[PDB]
Design a protein around this ligand. Structure first.
Ligand SMILES: [Cu+2]
Ligand SMILES: [Cu+2]
Ligand SMILES: [Cu+2]
Ligand SMILES: [Cu+2]
Ligand SMILES: [Cu+2]
Ligand SMILES: [Cu+2]
Ligand SMILES: [Cu+2]
Ligand SMILES: [Cu+2]
Ligand SMILES: [Cu+2]
Lengths: 298, 298, 298
């Protein structure tokens, strides 16, 4: 796109603030930002807020979201679709023009780990170019294993294709499949979908801890066979709904846009790979690392 | 196939009649019928009764099916496999020769949403050319959410490939992935697997209604990440068995031949897309529409 | 690999012996063995013990495994990863050098049907070349349907690609997808992943029996849509954990490395195909047969 040549808009922080016991304001941008998806490989991504996947959003079950999208893209309109919400797509997920802002309101009445993404036609084009992310809706009454969990992180899986190539998006194998982590608390890593960061800078944990991961496979195209090497998932909640409760899974099958809450215990010090067991995708980037130390540091 | 050149057998209505409290007769054809799978693109499909996917069959849990296949194909034998039934495949799912009829009897003792398809070797060839469909077996004691449902439809997902090309069937990406709807009651739409009909003529519903969809992904080759934009599935019964009960799913992962009953509420007027979240497949046709109005009409 | 030219190491039997009420010794080899994966097609596979998939391992819930790998490969190091166990991957799943042995100890504290595989980088290369298998961990308190089961078998699904071709492994469609069976009791078939053996020499059962299959899809890359023609799965335990209990499924979706225990009744004499319903994979080998006779013999 001619109007994107040379464009690299610095990331803009997510803005959220609660405005009522059950109402939250959220302000995001659509912007064009260069991301290093593999060593030496820059992708001029279409993003929310300069991250791909976009920034993490967390709300409570029953919150109504008052969402504003500010479109910084000079020529391409964009929109927002939250899987968490009940809304009219043709009224509430509509396009925002270049250099304009739009505000939309809708309720998040279901707990879980939901994909969000741009909903502008062709949707495949907007997602593949990077306009995806996760919103977590915390269950009012928690998860029955809440009191067993020592530490938690968010992981997202996505693919990257040949740059803005709709033929490749529809008919080709992914060039890269990647994990990224999004921060839940101060001190947590916050990364983009790439082949290397979570290998060189693993997530940290302590020997003996039970770890919870909030995970989603945003695609656009592949399903995911999610597995942590050296453990078994004690408990799994499909899409993060506390009722969808499985136990003792080695691997969790996730649809495109599929989410889960998974919990597992790390019993020994060492480095534990995290992968999608579809190992062609793991070979093309989709391996993260969890470093388990005696203290949780290092 | 030389004997199929110029052949276009007009669709023949499904014949069903109950013959006992737990016995039902079913008569279908195998026939060669031109179907417009994309605008300007005719596929000379191998079909049951001139539809692809074939006509909807509904029986009750515990019904024994007395099934007759009349093979109108001038040269290719065909057969029928109902996933709903217990049967001997080598005795009951056997080939019917051109211009011949065969009758087979077997019980449907499990509730749910089952694929049916031709079982003639090579099975891939018969399914890919269009010989697939759904049979629903209604649970004797219903679903626990039966009294919450306001309206219901059937949706089927299938792929189309290069015409009768076994290399493409085995090794290539689908040319099209499509939704079709099959009528449950008088007035319901009844369509074929194509890229456009359910976009131009959406399914209809009323603001505030809870909708049930009986769905199956007949393939032949892909899995499906089934999602309705702007809602969350309140309740999901995997393969339509009332015991396989999930709640609050954003997206339902379906194997090839996999079925489900899904229920969701539409809270606002508008047009709600229905897709497989594997968006390369959605881009190649697999998007339907649900139009929600104040009255349910229009 | 030059040092593999002409190499064909005869299969070596698995060695297992119990050494305590909750401790078991296991000794396996890594070796290079020619396997006929399709008629006239030899694959010089990287294997455990000269089989691909490797030999079946069965232990009890709560057993600690004292595992020894003897690496017979003249030049390539190999390692072992059991999905059943809790372990430190960077200490316990480490490489064993050519002509060396390594011993590792870890507990199997979860019931189910688990993949095992070599964990040497690049892992895709070792799995695709044949270093995969299944370990079953029997539940301390069994399955609630144990008393209904008349007969049981193990089936594994895997793919084969162009010989040791990392480009094909990552980016290409499988050349073959295959089933194999591993013996649970004296007299059971024990076969390798190929396109023909379980067609020409089907598994045997008796009319009216309820059959249990322990199944795993080891990949490396594809998911599986597991289906037995002519029946419906009465009961399914995902990953073989008794808590993950589904009923009345036509087809069971399995991730790469995904496992299940499935149970179904065969009501009539005949030959029942077993397939992955992703029929491009079935067409390329992934069809087995179950022959049901009045006596269970023949
Ligand atoms: Cu507001
Ligand atoms: Cu966009
Ligand atoms: Cu979506
Ligand atoms: Cu009759
Ligand atoms: Cu046919
Ligand atoms: Cu079938
Ligand atoms: Cu020992
Ligand atoms: Cu190896
Ligand atoms: Cu593994």
């Amino acid at each position: 796109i001619a109007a994107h040549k040379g464009v690299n808009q610095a990331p803009v922080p997510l803005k959220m603030e609660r405005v009522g016991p059950h109402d939250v304001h959220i302000e995001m941008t659509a912007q064009i930002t260069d991301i290093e998806i593999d060593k030496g490989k820059i992708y001029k991504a279409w993003t929310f807020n300069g991250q791909a996947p976009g920034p993490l959003v967390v709300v409570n079950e029953g919150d109504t979201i008052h969402f504003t999208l500010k479109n910084m893209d000079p020529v391409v309109p964009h929109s927002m679709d939250f899987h968490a919400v009940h809304a009219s797509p043709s009224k509430d997920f509509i396009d925002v023009m270049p250099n304009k802002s739009g505000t939309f309101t809708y309720p998040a009445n279901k707990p879980g780990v939901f994909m969000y993404h741009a909903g502008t036609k062709p949707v495949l084009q907007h997602i593949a170019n990077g306009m995806h992310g996760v919103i977590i809706v915390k269950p009012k009454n928690g998860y029955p294993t809440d009191k067993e969990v020592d530490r938690e992180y968010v992981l997202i899986q996505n693919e990257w294709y040949k740059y803005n190539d709709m033929n490749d998006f529809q008919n080709g194998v992914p060039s890269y499949v990647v994990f990224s982590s999004k921060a839940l608390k101060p001190g947590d890593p916050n990364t983009n979908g790439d082949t290397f960061t979570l290998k060189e800078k693993p997530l940290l944990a302590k020997v003996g801890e039970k770890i919870r991961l909030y995970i989603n496979n945003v695609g656009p195209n592949e399903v995911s066979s999610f597995h942590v090497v050296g453990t078994v998932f004690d408990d799994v909640y499909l899409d993060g709904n506390p009722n969808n409760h499985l136990q003792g899974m080695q691997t969790v099958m996730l649809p495109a846009s599929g989410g889960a809450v998974v919990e597992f215990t790390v019993t020994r010090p060492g480095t534990y790979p995290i992968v999608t067991h579809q190992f062609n995708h793991a070979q093309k980037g989709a391996v993260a690392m969890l470093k388990v130390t005696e203290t949780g540091e290092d």
